[PDB]
DNA sequence: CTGACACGTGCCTGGAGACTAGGGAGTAATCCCCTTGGCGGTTAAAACGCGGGGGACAGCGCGTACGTGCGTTTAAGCGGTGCTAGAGCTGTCTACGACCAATTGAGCGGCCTCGGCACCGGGATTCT
DNA sequence: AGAATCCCGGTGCCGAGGCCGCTCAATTGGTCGTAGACAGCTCTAGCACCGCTTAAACGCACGTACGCGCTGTCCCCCGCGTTTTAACCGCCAAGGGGATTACTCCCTAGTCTCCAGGCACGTGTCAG
DNA sequence: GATGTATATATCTGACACGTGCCTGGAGACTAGGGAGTAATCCCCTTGGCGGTTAAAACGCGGGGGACAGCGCGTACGTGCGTTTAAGCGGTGCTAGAGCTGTCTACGACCAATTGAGCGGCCTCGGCACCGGGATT
DNA sequence: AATCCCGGTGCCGAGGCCGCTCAATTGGTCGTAGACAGCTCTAGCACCGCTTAAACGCACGTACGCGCTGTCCCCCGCGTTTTAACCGCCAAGGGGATTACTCCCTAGTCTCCAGGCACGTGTCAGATATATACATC
């Protein structure tokens, strides 16, 4: 006689529904059980929270107010666990560290 | 101004800088110009030039920088082919 | 219609920092940040299902992958905060 | 009645000099230019490959960007921002 | 536990005629042919999955071999194929 | 009389059908996949095969041992490209010196 | 200590086969470290692995998984 | 007394060591070492006989590719004999 | 397992100096044996090919000397002995 | 004897002959091998291995004959490559 | 029915009018055949063969031997300036060459 | 069987040298000659044939390929030996 | 008159539809098309009659191919000879 | 009705070579697949002449194909050359073709 | 006497064509001879077609079979 | 004015070669024709292409004969063709 | 200062509430093998010392390679007119492959063996 | 001169290979829900082409910083010797836990519903 | 210093390129019967394996006759001009004979009953070849 | 020293007779196409005047083919060694060549309708003309 929302049962933004939906067209298994897309939303909304702090940090070093792609960039190559979980990745617009190495810098 | 020093302001700038580099119509034309040897009168969207180019400058930067390493290891600061190739061999696409 | 997760990263940055505004360039990046995450999550858990020759995806195979996938620091407060959500979905 | 002539000196001097210095470039042979177009073929023509077989096997005439993603990612060298 | 042995065994004997093959040999055959099945299979199966088909078939497998092979090899995996189906049909 | 010979194959094209189909791979699965993929491990297996026993013929010996194979992955230029981050355990490696290290 | 019984002569016939004909003498522990790093992280794998099947004995294929999901693959042991 | 010049036998050794497919380190020691990292992760672990073996293939293998790169490294900086430094450049390039 | 190997110093240079001899031949350069086995070369491999597809087309094994004669005319160079 | 005093004999000798000249065996093997080319698994009937020869030693003692007579027109005794050369490219070949 | 006389004996030949017939039709060179080709090519063909044999004899009597080999024949088809055109492409088996030295390669 | 000219090479030997006789190699030699100039023969009597709209080779058509085909004196005696023959039938 | 002076039209107009042909090279085409028809058509006669054969079938049309035409040409032309051939059957 | 050369996708006329086999007296029978691997092996040498004929008009920047573009295609391919080698085209000409001996 | 129509510089402007680039002054009469040869070999054959055809007219399909048969087929006046 | 030997020569040869017209006249070849002709026959007829023909064929046996002749008189080292060339030729393309 | 972000509106098709059927996984009990445990001995290998000359690498010299700066010139980028190939959606229907069932012979586990390999040793040749 | 590699020969064993039982996974005959092959439409955005702009593309001069070379030296590793220790083999114990099984259930896929979340479509103002 | 071919703008006229009628060449379908595909066999002639001796092939020597690199030379033919002639053009005129329609009958395609001319086989006996010695070139 | 010629031995090929069967012969009808008769309209041969491009004869200059000379190095004639060709005997089995059953493929026939081949059209691609540039020797 009323219907309240799954994400909102579990405390989470994103929604556990569409991670069940993608599962089950998926093909990744004949079975799926009921905690794994609370589970697996609660992963990715933690992963997206860590990556948005720091880009936040960054846009107020440039006293930005709008977060744009070098953002990203700088929060990803910055933290050693990320770096490690994207190194496999190339980012649009995204461009490099300021890196020289130390033999080049003059005496 | 002596040798460097505008190189090194070259460096710092396009460090900074994160405009593409590549002429968009040239690499364009190279495009047309190799795909019709798999197939002539091909078609392309004009995102797709735009991700070839990216992916290409990125490939590229990621093997200037480890022949520079390859460059400081002989001791030298200017890179040389060899450094290519052998960059390229230790990361096994050689 | 397209599907895309752009309401729910607005929701998460507003309660990280409800001052900043995001570009969709950015949102689209998020966007495929999440479906390859998502994509490699999901293939250790079917070859972690297969190998003991089990049919279903339980919370276990979802925990083993994200304790695989993810280096030591992440994957201690992911889990704590999985089982923490599940916890409060079952209770 | 058309055929293309070869485009080899399109990319400009100047745009390998700007690429290089993104990467840390103080100094650069000047035998590095051809080694660069070489490797950068070399590189065109493993994507385009890949992409024109997706172009095919959907039956499609024209090229479609994400082809070239999937060419990257069957390669291994995923690229965000284009698609997802 | 099924295996393929018996089957590379025969192809042994069309090749090479009074040579035998010991089991460490016959074990990475084994897991050779396991390792190519399984490629083969996801790369079609993406193929079916981005054009929103539901189905594998021939032309899928066709353009795995084009993509996961060299070229001179999917060429005559390509003529082999082929050639069977042609002649099955 | 079995698809195998049929299509004129050695290999289990009733065995492949079936892990086409129970491996989740695609919810549907026709009848040209398992000829044709059946056919091209056929192929792949007795391409390698006639280059090790080559070298097995070489060797003077009657059998093929995992030596024989590594030799023949590694010399033939494209299936090192196929193979190039498998390791065959007993294998060793192809002799190499490099031509400064010699008198 | 048992990082000790990986001998020098053990690290000599090594670099002999990969065709290295001589040998700083400060090499030795620096190998003894890469190979302890790498073995952690194979180890690391193979006891999740046997943790989730709640087995107590490491098998094989743990390790020829591990391996694999490192991406240099090992013919030879099954799989 | 008879006495080969230096490094006359180390080409014999490099010629040797190529030819055969012997497993080169002491069994007993690395079973020991592999039973001293696993008591870490968990304790009263036990190891099959075979798994020890995979092991040993496998660092062994990464042994010998890594020394393989060694030596590129070393000839590239006209030496003969690899030190440290060839290491860690060949582990950066790899990415490691 | 059985394979030949290359047999073409098989035709003696003593050989081509008697054959060179029915020509009426007095005097001859010694570059003149290499050069003289690479046509007699190329001339068989023609002759040979031609005669195989006569072989196959007719699915034997064995290759007859009416396949040789019939290539030879073919070729205009027609060989009287041999029947047809 | 002096130079060329035998060579005489011999051109008398052999034009005066009926003879095959080149060794059966070797000719035989070379005929086997070029053959391996365009199929394995071929035999030969006894008579086509003669045929061929036959075949073969008329063609060349027409080309030395052309030689020959190219040698004669550049003021020549000796036959040389060139003459071969020019003999074969006036023939079309 | 009246006794046989071969047409052979009609025309005074010995070549086999019955069998040039018959491989006319059979040769498809063309959908009818009438009576006078056979026996004009019979008599050509016979006219040849006597010439041929003529002349072989004759090289045959000069070698003081009782029978005809291919030597006699390369023999006579080479020295007949007439018979060396129509058969100029032809090579016959063991028959070898006319001895042909040039002037230039023998002594003064 | 084998069908031959060996028979009618041998009757012809024996009306211009009776002592001779003749090897099968040499028989051989006659009884592929003999195959040849028929089929060409034959072979331009067919197109002469062909090109006039004509259906027919007759006796016109033979003896205008023997004055194509052979030399001139051989055809002069080869016509007038045909011209004999196929008067002389005529007659019959 | 009978004539090919349609289909080297309609062949011209695939390969280049802006270009036009002279009636002289037109009369040079039909030629080249009567003189490749009776090698072809000798050659196929004459491997039928070898083998004491009747008929002439795709076979001997394939053998004369292949005979006559340099080896590039040849497999070209076989390719397409037995692709039109399974199109039509 | 359909024709049979469309049916085989093929321009030129599959009847017509086929009724000229029958009436060339080549053999007393032919074979139902003959005709069409004929025209296309016809169409194919067609096709490959006009090609080279047409890029050698445009290389005069002519449109209209005339018989020296024949001879320049025959003569600059090394099989065509050998499959038409016994062959004169009338108005064709030459290639110009000094020998290097005479040259300065 | 109409073989003096074929002129000496007709004769040359073919050796030019031929790529002749000297021409000794012996060649001319030669050349007569061997193109009157040619002629004759081949006008034999073209009026023994003319006759079998009864005809009292040459016609040119006539000199393309005379060519045709001698082996120097032409393209272009027929087929 | 004067030009030096070969070079107009030279000039000819390219023209020749570029240019495509029948260099033979029409009206004494066609005597020519009808004076041989009628030994075979008196009182023939001709049709008009006949003749062109005819002078199509002459001229390009001529242009391959002296073609031939030119290899022939290169070998020699010389650079004038002699009527031995001519002679030589024939005799081995086999008409002589 | 101008348009990308940030907001407001309609609405429809994706999700949630509830009942249903039946089979994938949790359980208790077992077997037994292969893993961990101890012991002897000899002898391969590792360990510790010696000798020393060939390697790594620190130094001075040098000439050229390409970084920095300018005037010339050219075509990449912009705004725009114009079209229509083909990309993307709606409609029809029928070619085909998912899933059942009765049937049976192709491939796996086992015993046996006999001979190819390996283990053994001696004499000739290469090479330092 | 003489050390190590090579090659030729004999012994005897334990692994590959043949036959055997046998059973479970492949085969054939079959229906039927469907989704994808084809037909038609239609409206986006891609390619062609026009004039304008001036940023960038280009060739050149020139200056000295850098890579390559020859030289030295000393110290540390390779080749060799004597000692000694724990690896390696093999025999005898024994029991923990991998691997299998029969019962049971509570968990998930399937289905109809209906209503509201968020996704096109319209807007304008404040961040750049 | 100055003559060759290339290129640009314009005229104009007819060869190419199109459109029309229509008829005879092709396609749709059914029919009859025989050329080629098949399964099984035989056996011969091809490929396998060995010994021995000795012709042939191979490696070295000697050396002088050949290929071919050089200077000399005188004439043979390419270049350039003024003279003259007849090949090419437009046209009037005719009619020999080339090409088509009509008639019909001389003849050769195809059947059949008949039978002896030519092929495959055994036998042999003597012409050739193999052998050797003495005279001449 | 090699070619020639005269003489003797003995064998395996040509040549005769024999069986026999299948391909040539004779008598015959009949569909036809080609031999002859007649027409008629093309284009070939004959003749005329005009045009000027080409052909012809000549001068002349030096580039080229023919000749004499040299030399050095490489095969041709000869010797000693040695090896695998050649002969001949014994094995054996793959695949050429033949056969009896069967069928599914192609030639034959009537149809009718539309593809492409004569006959009418006109316009734009080219040749021709004029102009003139710069490459070459």
Partial sequence: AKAKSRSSRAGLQFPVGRVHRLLRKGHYAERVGAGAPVYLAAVLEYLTAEILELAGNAARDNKKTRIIPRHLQLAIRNDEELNKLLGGVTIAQGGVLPNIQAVLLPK | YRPGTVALREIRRYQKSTELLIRKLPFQRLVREIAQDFKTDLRFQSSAVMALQEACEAYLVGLFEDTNLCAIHAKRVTIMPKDIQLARRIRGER | ?91 | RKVLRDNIQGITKPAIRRLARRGGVKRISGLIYEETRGVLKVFLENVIRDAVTYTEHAKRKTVTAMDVVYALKRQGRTLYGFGG
């Fill in chain 3, 1 to 91: 219609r397209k599907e895309s997760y752009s309401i729910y990263v607005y929701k998460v940055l507003k309660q990280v920092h409800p001052d900043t505004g995001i570009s969709s360039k950015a949102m689209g990046i998020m966007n495929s940040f999440v479906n390859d995450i998502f994509e490699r999550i999901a293939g250790e858990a079917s070859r972690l299902a297969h190998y003991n020759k089990r049919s279903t995806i339980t919370s276990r195979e979802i925990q083993t992958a994200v304790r695989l996938l993810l280096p030591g620091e992440l994957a201690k407060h992911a889990v704590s905060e999985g089982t923490k959500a599940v916890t409060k979905y079952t209770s």
